[PDB]
Structure 1
Amino acid sequence: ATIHVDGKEYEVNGADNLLEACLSLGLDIPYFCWHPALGSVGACRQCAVKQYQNAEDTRGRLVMSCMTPASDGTFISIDDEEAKQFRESVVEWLMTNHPHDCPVCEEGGNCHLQDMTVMTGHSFRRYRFTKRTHRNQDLGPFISHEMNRCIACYRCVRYYKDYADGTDLGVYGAHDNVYFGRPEDGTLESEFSGNLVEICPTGVFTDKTHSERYNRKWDMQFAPSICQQCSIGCNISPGERYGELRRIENRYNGTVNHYFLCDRGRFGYGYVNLKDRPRQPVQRRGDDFITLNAEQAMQGAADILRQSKKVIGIGSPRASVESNFALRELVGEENFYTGIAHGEQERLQLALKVLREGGIYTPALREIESYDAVLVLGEDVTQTGARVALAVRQAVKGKAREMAAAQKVADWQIAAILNIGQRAKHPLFVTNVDDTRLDDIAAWTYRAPVEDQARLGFAIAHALDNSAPAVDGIEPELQSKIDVIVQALAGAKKPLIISGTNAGSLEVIQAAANVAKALKGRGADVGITMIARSVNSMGLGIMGGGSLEEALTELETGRADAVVVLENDLHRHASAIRVNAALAKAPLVMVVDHQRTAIMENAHLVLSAASFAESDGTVINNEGRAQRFFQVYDPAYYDSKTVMLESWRWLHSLHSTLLSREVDWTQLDHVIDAVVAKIPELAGIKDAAPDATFRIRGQKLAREPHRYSGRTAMRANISVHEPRQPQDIDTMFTFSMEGNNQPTAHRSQVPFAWAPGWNSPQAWNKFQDEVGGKLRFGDPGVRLFETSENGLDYFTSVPARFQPQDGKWRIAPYYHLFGSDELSQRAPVFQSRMPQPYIKLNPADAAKLGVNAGTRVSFSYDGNTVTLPVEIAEGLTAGQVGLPMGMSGIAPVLAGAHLEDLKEA
C-alpha cells in the first residue's frame, strides 16, 4: 500500500493501522492507549491526524491513526494545524487533573506522559480549577500503586485481562472518577503482573523493588543480558547504580520475549545485591579464613592441585557455557561431571535428543503464539517456564483472531476481534499431578500421577497412529477424553506439544515425543517444546559429563582427592548427608561461586565468582538458542578490595597456573574459540554475539545513557581523584557513555532503548524494523541445531498405571514461580511472595492418617525427618504427597521419589 504523509509518499503494509505504519517509518505521532502487543481501541484520542480522501482535498477530517487502516491512496497530515492543536488539547485535558508529582515519581525521566507532553508542545497551564484525587491500594511486594497519575488510557486492564488473562485487575467507577486497580487490597495474582510497570505510560504502576533503591534512567548503567531464573532465555536489560543491581527491564527480543517478562525474572534479581556474597578469594586454614588476592589464590590452589592425584570437576546448569567448559578443561573431559543427578541428566539428555534428533521443529517463544492446538504433558508451565504459558494463552486466543479475519476485520481492531470470538478458543489440554494456572483456558485438564500422564500421552499417540505402541487398561471415560484430544490434535493445522524435565519422569517426555512423531507422520506442522530447569540446563546437556552421583562415589571411594565445584550448591541434586560426607572426606574442596552456599563450610578454597551482572558468557535456552549475556558493571570500581571474576576467567587462570606455573586471565573470545574448537555441537555460540573488536564506525557500544551524571562525585568520598573508567577487554561494550546507542546502529545487542523525544519503553519503536516486529538488524541469539531430516523411533516403554501401596508415598512435584528457583528464592523480596511450606494430601489419605488441614506431619527421606503442615489437595491422586520443589530442604531431585513413615507429629 502507498500512503501520503504531509506530501511525502511512503510504502506501508495495508493490513496495518496508520499509527503503527507511521511509527514504523520514523514519524512521530503521540499516542497513549495503543500498544503494539495489545491492538488499537481508540480510547485516549491522542493519535489524531488529519485525513484527506484525495490529493486535491484541503478540508480534511481528524481521525485516529491507530483506528485507521493504512490502505492504498490515503492522504494524511500529522503536522496539520488542527491536528497539532487537537493533540495539544488532549495532552492539556490529561494535564488538568495530573498531580504535581514528577520529582517524587518513579516514572520521571522514563515517563511516556512526560514525553508526549513535551512532544505536543504543551507547556503553559491555563486550567485554574481543582484536580481530582484518588486513594491508593496495596498491590503486594512488587507493584506500587499511585492512581493520581492515571490518564485513563486503559492499557493496564487491556494487558492484564485480555492479554495475560488475569482476573484481579479491573476498571471501576465512571466518568472522570474511573479507577484502575484491584477490587480490594491484595497482591496481584498474575505471574506477569510486573509488565504493568512498562505497559502503564505513567507512574501509577511502578516497580516497588526498584523504588526501594531508586535512581533515574539516565543514571543507570545498562547491559544486554539473559534472565538466569529459568530456561526460557528472555532478554533483559539489567541496570545498576553505585555498585548494586537496581532494576531489571525488558530488553526487546522480537524472537523470544518481545515486550514481556514474567515476575520471577523481573523481581527475582535481588540475590545479586546480598551482602553475604563472596567478594574475595578466601582460603581456610584450620578454623581461620585468610583473604587472598587473585594471584595468591591461583598459586596456592595450583600447588595443591599439582600435589593431588586426581582432580574432578562438578559443573552446574547455573553456570555459563564458558565456565563449564573451563572447568572441563581444568580437570579433563573424563573427570568432568555435570552437577545434576542421574535421573535429571537422563531426562535432560532425552529432551535434547528429542529436540535435535526428533525431526520436529522446536519453536521460539514468540512463535508459540501462532499454534492452533496445544497439548501440555507433565510440565507445570506457569510455574516453571512462565513466558511459555503467556505465549500459549496468545495461541489459544488465535481462534477468535481467525474468526474475526473471516469477517474481514482488521487484525489491530482488538475489541471487534474479542467481540466476535466471545468464549471460543483453540484447544488446550494440560496434564499435571494437580490443577494448573492454565486450567481457566484449558479445554481439558488431566490430574493424574506422572505414569498416568505418560500413559495418556502414549494412548493419544496410539490413537493418532496405530504404529505407535498401545497402552491397555484405559477406562471408557478416559478413552472418550482421549478421543476428544485426538480429534482436536488431528484437526489442527499447527499442533504444539509441550513437555519438559520438571515432571520428573522420563516416560512423560517419551510420550510427548511419541505424540509429536504421530502428528508428524500424518503430515501436520507439529512443533515440540521442552522446558528445562535452569538457565543453562541445555548447554550442560549438550556438553555432557557424568552425573553428580558418579562424582560423589569418586570422592567417597577416595579415587578423587580434589574436587572443584562450579556454581553448584550440590544439595538440590543429591542428599545433603551424602554430599557433606563426600566433601568432608575429600582433602581439597574448591568452590567457585557468587552466592554463600552451604558447601563452603567444608571448602578449603572459595573463589569469589561473578554473578551474571558482573560476568559475560553464553547460555543455551530451552529451544537450543545460544545467547550471550554481557557484564553490567565492574564490581571493583568502588570497592578496590573486591576480587570478583568470571568463573571461566578463574578456571582458565587456574589451568594456566597448574600447567605453566603462570597466571593467564585471558579474554572471553579466546574461551569461546576454545569451546567451538573442542566441542563441535557448541560451535554456534561463536555467532551469538560479535567479538570484542566489533565497532559502530570505530566506536564501542555504550553501557550508560549520554546524560549519565555524577562522574566526578560518585566516587569522591573514596578519593577526590577520578579513576579511569573500567576497561572491557572481553566484549564490544564500554563501561561509559562514550559509545554508540543509536537506534539505526548496525547491531543486534541493544543495552537499553532511548531516542530523542522518547525516554520511555516506547523508545523500543525506534529500534525495530516495524513496531512490534523484529529488531531492525535481526534479533540476537542463534539456534545451535536445525531440525533433523529423520526423526526417532516410537518409544515402546509404556509404563504401568500408578498403584498406591501402603506406607509408601509418591512425591508429586509442586513448582512455584516464587520459590522453586534457587537464586531468585534467595532474593529478600521473594520471601513475602513465597508460599508457606506445606505438604499436599488427598482427602482420603489425610482421613486415613487421621490428619486435618493445617496439622504438622513428619516424614523421613534419606535420614532427614522433617515436619510440614498439611494442606488438603482435592485434585491430587491418592497415594501421593505433594511437595514444593526447590524450597529450603526440599530438593527438586525428590520429584518422583518415595516417602516412608508419614505420620502425624
Structure 2
Amino acid sequence: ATIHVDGKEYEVNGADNLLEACLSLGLDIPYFCWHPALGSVGACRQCAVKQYQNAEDTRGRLVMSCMTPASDGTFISIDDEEAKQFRESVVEWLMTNHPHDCPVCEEGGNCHLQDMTVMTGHSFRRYRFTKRTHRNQDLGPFISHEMNRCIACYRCVRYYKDYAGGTDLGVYGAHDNVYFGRPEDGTLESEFSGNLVEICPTGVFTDKTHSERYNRKWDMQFAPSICQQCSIGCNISPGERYGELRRIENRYNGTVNHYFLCDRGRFGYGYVNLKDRPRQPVQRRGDDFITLNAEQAMQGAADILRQSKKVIGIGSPRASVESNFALRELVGEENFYTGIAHGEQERLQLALKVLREGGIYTPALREIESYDAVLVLGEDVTQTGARVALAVRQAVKGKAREMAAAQKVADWQIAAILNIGQRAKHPLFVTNVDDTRLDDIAAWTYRAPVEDQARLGFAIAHALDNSAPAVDGIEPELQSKIDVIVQALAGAKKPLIISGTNAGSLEVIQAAANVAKALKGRGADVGITMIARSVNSMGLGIMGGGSLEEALTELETGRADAVVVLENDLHRHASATRVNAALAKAPLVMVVDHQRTAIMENAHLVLSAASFAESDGTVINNEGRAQRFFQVYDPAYYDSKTVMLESWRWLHSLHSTLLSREVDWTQLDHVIDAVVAKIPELAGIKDAAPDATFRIRGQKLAREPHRYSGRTAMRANISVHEPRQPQDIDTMFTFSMEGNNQPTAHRSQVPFAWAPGWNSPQAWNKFQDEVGGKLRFGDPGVRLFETSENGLDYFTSVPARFQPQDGKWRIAPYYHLFGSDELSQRAPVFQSRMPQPYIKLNPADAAKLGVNAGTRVSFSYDGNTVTLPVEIAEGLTAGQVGLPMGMSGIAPVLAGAHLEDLKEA
C-alpha cells in the first residue's frame, strides 16, 4: 500500500490501520485507547488525522487513524491545523477532571498521559469548574488503585476481559461517572493482572510492591534480564536504586513474551532484597562464623579440597549454564551431579528428547497464539507456565479471528471480530488431576489421575493413527469424548500438544509425544510444547549429570568426602532427613548460593553467590532458546564490605586456586567459550548475546537513563568522596549513563525503552521495526536445536488404569503461581498472596475417613508426620489426596508418590 502523509510518500502494510502504520514510520500521533496487542476501538478520539479524498483536496475530513485502514493511495495529514486543534482539545477535555497529582503519583515520569499532554502542546488551563472525584478500591497486595486519574480509555477492561480472560474487572456506571475496577473490594484473581500497570496509560493501576520503595524511572539502573521464576524465559527489565531491586518491567521480545508477563515474574522478585542473604564468604570454625574476603575463602577452600580424596558437585536448575559448567569443570564430569531427583531427571530428559529428536517443531511463546487446536496433557499451565496459558487463550480466540476475516473485517477491528465470533472458539482440551484456570475456555476438561490422562493421550494417538499402541478398557462415554477430541484435532490445520514435567509422570509426556507423532503422520502442521520446572531446567538437562540420589549415595557411602552445592537447597528434590544425614556425614560441605538455605547450617564454607540481579549468565528456556541475562547493579557500590560474586566466577577461581595455587577470577566470555568448546550441544549460547567488546559506534550500552540523578549525593553519607564507577568487564553494558540506548542502535538487547517525548512503555513502539512486531534488529535469544529430520518411535508402554489401593494415597500435585516456585516464596509480598496450605480430598474419601472441610489431618511421609487442614475437592478422583507442591515442607518431588497412615489428628 502507498500512503501520503503531509506530502511525503510512504510504503506501508495495507492490513494495518493508519495509526500503527504511521507509528511504524516514526511519525508521532497521540493515542490513548489503542494498543498493539488489543486492537482498535475508537474510544478516546485522540488519534485524529485529516484524510483527503484525492491529492487535489483542500477540505478533507477528520478521521480516527486507529479505525482507518492504511489502504493503497491514501492521503492524510497529521500536522494539519484543524487536526492539531482537535487533538489538543481532546487532551484538554481529559485534563478537566484530572487530579493535581503528578508529584505524588507513581506514574510520574513514566506516564503516557503526561507525554501526550506535552506532545499536543496543551499547557494552558481555561477550565475553572469542579473536578469529579472517585473513591478507590483495595485490589490486593500487587495493584494499587486510584480512579481519580482515569481518562476512560477502556484499555484495562479490554486487556483484562478480552485478552487475559479475567472476570472480576469491569466498567460500571455511566456518562462521566464511569468506574473501572472490581464489583467489590478484593484481590484481582487473574494471574496476569500485573500487566495493568503498563496497560493503563495513567496512574490508576500502579505497582504496589514498587510503590513501597518508590523511585522515578529516570533514577533507575536497568538491565536486560530473563525472569527466573519458571521455564518460559520471559524477557524482563529489572531496575535498581540505592542497591536494591526496585522493579521488574516487561522487556519487549517479539518472539517470546511480547508485552506481557505473569504476576509471579512481575512481583516475585522480592527475594533479592532479603536482609538474610549472604553478603560475604563465611567459614565455620567450631561454633564461630568467621568472615573472609574472596582471596582467603579461595585459598582455604582450595587447600581443604586439595586435601580431599573425591569432591563431588551438585548443580541446580536455578543456576545459569556457566555456573553449572564451572562446577562441572571444578569437580570433573564424572563427579558432577544435577541437583534434581532421578524421576525428575528422567522426565526432563524425555521432554528434551521429544523436543530435539521428535521431528516436530516446538513453537516460541508468541507463535503459540497462531495454532488452531490445543491439547494440554497433564500440565496445569496457568500455575506453572502462565504465559503459555495466556498465549493459549489467544490461540483459542483465533477462531473468531478467522470467522471475521472471512467477512472482510480487518484484524484491528476487534469489536467487530468479537461481535462476529460470539462464543465460537478453537478447540481446547485440558487434562489435569482437578480443575484448571483454562476450564472456562476449554472445549473439554478431563479430571483424572496422571495414569488416566496418559491413557487418554495414548487412546487419542491410537485413534488418530492405528499404528500407535492401543488402550484396552476405555468406557464408551470416555470413548465418545476421545472421538470428539480426535475429530477436533484431525480437522485442525495447526494442532498444538502441550505437556511437561510438572505432572510427575513419564507416561503423560510419552502420550503427548505419541499424539504429536500421530498428527505429524497425517500431514498436519503440529507443534509440541514441553513446560519444564525452573529457569534453567532445560540447560541442566542438556548438560546432563547424575541425579541427586546418586550424589547422596556417594556422600553416605563415604566415597566422596567433599561436596560443593551450587544454588540448591536440596530439600525440594530429596527427603530432608536423608539430605541432612548425608551432609552431616560429609567432612566438607561448601554451599555457593545467594539465598539463606537450610543446608548452610551443615556447611563448612558458604560462598556468597550473586542472584540474577547481580550476575550475568545464560539460561535455556522450555523451548530450547538460549538467553543471556546481564547484571543490573554492582552489590559493592554502596556496601564496600559486600563480597558477592557470580557463581561461575567463584567456581572458576576455586578451580584455578586448586590447580595452580593462584587466584584467577575469570571473564564471562572466557567461560562462554569454554562451554561451547567442551559441550557442543550448548554451542548456541555463544550467539545469545554479543561479547563484551561489542560497541555501538564505539560506545557501550547504557544501563541507566540520561537524566540519572543524585550521582554526587547518593553515597555522600558514607563518604563525601565519590566512588569509582563500577567497571563491567563481563558484558557490553556500562554501569552508568555514558553509553547508548538509541532506538535505532544496531543491537537486540534493550535495557529499557525511552525516546524523547515517549517516557511511558509506549517507547517500545520506537524500538520496533513495526509496532507490535519484532525488535528492529531482531529479537534476542537463539534456539539451541532445530527440528529433527526424523522423529521418534511410538512409546509402546501404555500404563494400566489407576487403582485406589487401601492404606495408600496417591499424591496429586496442585501447583500455585504464588508459592510453588522456590525463590518467589521468599518474597515477602507473596506471603499475603500465597494461599494457606490445605490438603485436597475427595468427598467419598473424606466421608470414609470421617473428616469434614477444615479439620486437621496428619500424615507421615518418609517417617515425618505433618498436619494440614482439609478442603473437599469434588473433581479429585477418589484414592488420591491433593497436595500443594513447592510449599514449605512439601517438596515438588512428592508428586506421584504415595502416602501412608493419613488420618485425622
- Does TM, scored on the shorter chain, surpass 0.5? yes
* Structure 1 vs Structure 2 CA RMSD: 0.2
* Structure 1 residue 873, shift from structure 2 partner: 0.0
Q: Distance between the aligned counterparts of 1:523 and 1:535, measured in 2?
A: 33
* Structure 1 residue 724, shift from structure 2 partner: 1.6
* Structure 1 residue 658, shift from structure 2 partner: 0.1
The runs of at least 4 aligned residues of structure 1 exceeding 4 Å deviation read: none
SS in 2 for 1:440: coil
* Structure 1 residue 868, shift from structure 2 partner: 0.3
SS in 1 for 2:869: strand
SS in 1 for 2:85: helix
Q: Distance between the aligned counterparts of 1:12 and 1:595, measured in 2?
A: 51
* Structure 1 residue 773, shift from structure 2 partner: 0.1
Deviation readout 1:39-96 (Å, 9 max, x if unpaired): 0000000000000010100000000000000001110000000000000000000000
Q: Distance between the aligned counterparts of 1:719 and 1:100, measured in 2?
A: 38
* Structure 1 residue 709, shift from structure 2 partner: 0.2
Q: Distance between the aligned counterparts of 2:510 and 2:119, measured in 1?
A: 57
SS in 2 for 1:93: helix
* Structure 1 residue 648, shift from structure 2 partner: 0.1
Q: Distance between the aligned counterparts of 2:898 and 2:72, measured in 1?
A: 67
1:472 lines up with 2:464 in the alignment: no
Q: Distance between the aligned counterparts of 1:398 and 1:44, measured in 2?
A: 26
Q: Distance between the aligned counterparts of 1:148 and 1:382, measured in 2?
A: 33
Query: What is the total number of aligned residue pairs between the two structures?
Result: 905
Deviation readout 1:595-641 (Å, 9 max, x if unpaired): 00000000000000000000000000000000000000000000000
SS in 1 for 2:717: coil
Q: Distance between the aligned counterparts of 2:160 and 2:664, measured in 1?
A: 51
Task: Give the structure-1-normalised TM-score.
Answer: 1.00
* Structure 1 residue 453, shift from structure 2 partner: 0.2
SS in 1 for 2:890: coil
Match of 1:16 in 2: 16
Aligned pairs for 1:724-763 within 5 A: 724-763=724-763
SS in 1 for 2:438: helix
Task: Give the structure-2-normalised TM-score.
Answer: 1.00
Q: Distance between the aligned counterparts of 2:441 and 2:898, measured in 1?
A: 33
Q: Distance between the aligned counterparts of 2:73 and 2:173, measured in 1?
A: 42
Q: Distance between the aligned counterparts of 2:278 and 2:137, measured in 1?
A: 39
SS in 2 for 1:899: strand
* Structure 1 residue 410, shift from structure 2 partner: 0.3
Q: Distance between the aligned counterparts of 2:280 and 2:598, measured in 1?
A: 17
SS in 2 for 1:590: strand
Q: Distance between the aligned counterparts of 2:765 and 2:837, measured in 1?
A: 44
* Structure 1 residue 424, shift from structure 2 partner: 0.3
Deviation readout 1:451-477 (Å, 9 max, x if unpaired): 000000000000000000001000000
Q: Distance between the aligned counterparts of 1:783 and 1:749, measured in 2?
A: 16
* Structure 1 residue 445, shift from structure 2 partner: 0.2
Aligned pairs for 1:387-786 within 5 A: 387-786=387-786
Deviation readout 1:138-176 (Å, 9 max, x if unpaired): 000000000000000000000000000000000000000
Q: Distance between the aligned counterparts of 1:31 and 1:751, measured in 2?
A: 25
Deviation readout 1:411-445 (Å, 9 max, x if unpaired): 00000000000000000000000000000000000
Q: Distance between the aligned counterparts of 1:148 and 1:112, measured in 2?
A: 16
SS in 1 for 2:328: helix
Match of 1:244 in 2: 244
SS in 1 for 2:399: helix
Deviation readout 1:787-820 (Å, 9 max, x if unpaired): 0000000000000000001010000000000000
Q: Distance between the aligned counterparts of 1:53 and 1:29, measured in 2?
A: 20
Where does the alignment leave 5 or more consecutive residues of structure 1 unmatched?
A: none
Q: Distance between the aligned counterparts of 1:286 and 1:884, measured in 2?
A: 38
* Structure 1 residue 241, shift from structure 2 partner: 0.1
* Structure 1 residue 519, shift from structure 2 partner: 0.1
Q: Matched residues, percent identical?
A: 100
* Structure 1 residue 221, shift from structure 2 partner: 0.1
SS in 1 for 2:425: coil
Deviation readout 1:834-884 (Å, 9 max, x if unpaired): 000110000000000000000000000001100000000000000000000
* Structure 1 residue 897, shift from structure 2 partner: 0.1
* Structure 1 residue 718, shift from structure 2 partner: 0.5
Deviation readout 1:674-722 (Å, 9 max, x if unpaired): 0000000000000000000000000000000000000000000001010
Q: Distance between the aligned counterparts of 1:86 and 1:641, measured in 2?
A: 59
Deviation readout 1:206-236 (Å, 9 max, x if unpaired): 0000000000000000000000000000000
SS in 2 for 1:122: coil
Q: Distance between the aligned counterparts of 2:665 and 2:49, measured in 1?
A: 59
Q: Distance between the aligned counterparts of 2:756 and 2:725, measured in 1?
A: 26
Q: Distance between the aligned counterparts of 2:93 and 2:109, measured in 1?
A: 21
Deviation readout 1:323-377 (Å, 9 max, x if unpaired): 0000000000000000000000000000000000000000000000000000000
* Structure 1 residue 562, shift from structure 2 partner: 0.1
Q: Distance between the aligned counterparts of 1:659 and 1:902, measured in 2?
A: 53
Q: Distance between the aligned counterparts of 2:573 and 2:598, measured in 1?
A: 14
Q: Distance between the aligned counterparts of 2:834 and 2:424, measured in 1?
A: 34
SS in 1 for 2:277: coil
Aligned pairs for 1:34-73 within 5 A: 34-73=34-73
SS in 1 for 2:158: helix
Q: Distance between the aligned counterparts of 1:725 and 1:538, measured in 2?
A: 36
Q: Distance between the aligned counterparts of 1:564 and 1:588, measured in 2?
A: 8
Q: Distance between the aligned counterparts of 2:275 and 2:97, measured in 1?
A: 43
Deviation readout 1:240-279 (Å, 9 max, x if unpaired): 0000000000000000000000000000000000000000
Deviation readout 1:276-316 (Å, 9 max, x if unpaired): 00000000001110000000000000000000000000000
Q: Distance between the aligned counterparts of 1:806 and 1:870, measured in 2?
A: 20
SS in 2 for 1:438: coil
SS in 1 for 2:300: helix
1:201 lines up with 2:205 in the alignment: no
Q: Distance between the aligned counterparts of 2:471 and 2:771, measured in 1?
A: 49
Q: Distance between the aligned counterparts of 2:471 and 2:178, measured in 1?
A: 57
Q: Distance between the aligned counterparts of 2:53 and 2:567, measured in 1?
A: 65
Match of 2:145 in 1: 145
Q: Distance between the aligned counterparts of 1:824 and 1:189, measured in 2?
A: 18
SS in 2 for 1:539: helix
Match of 1:812 in 2: 812
Match of 2:271 in 1: 271
Q: Distance between the aligned counterparts of 1:857 and 1:327, measured in 2?
A: 43
SS in 1 for 2:161: helix
Match of 1:878 in 2: 878
Match of 1:168 in 2: 168
Q: Distance between the aligned counterparts of 2:180 and 2:903, measured in 1?
A: 48
SS in 2 for 1:492: coil
Q: Distance between the aligned counterparts of 1:903 and 1:220, measured in 2?
A: 53
* Structure 1 residue 723, shift from structure 2 partner: 1.2
Q: Distance between the aligned counterparts of 1:902 and 1:637, measured in 2?
A: 53
SS in 2 for 1:846: helix
Q: Distance between the aligned counterparts of 1:451 and 1:666, measured in 2?
A: 48
Q: Distance between the aligned counterparts of 2:513 and 2:664, measured in 1?
A: 46
Deviation readout 1:195-214 (Å, 9 max, x if unpaired): 00000000000000000000
* Structure 1 residue 583, shift from structure 2 partner: 0.1
* Structure 1 residue 549, shift from structure 2 partner: 0.0
Match of 1:894 in 2: 894
SS in 1 for 2:622: coil
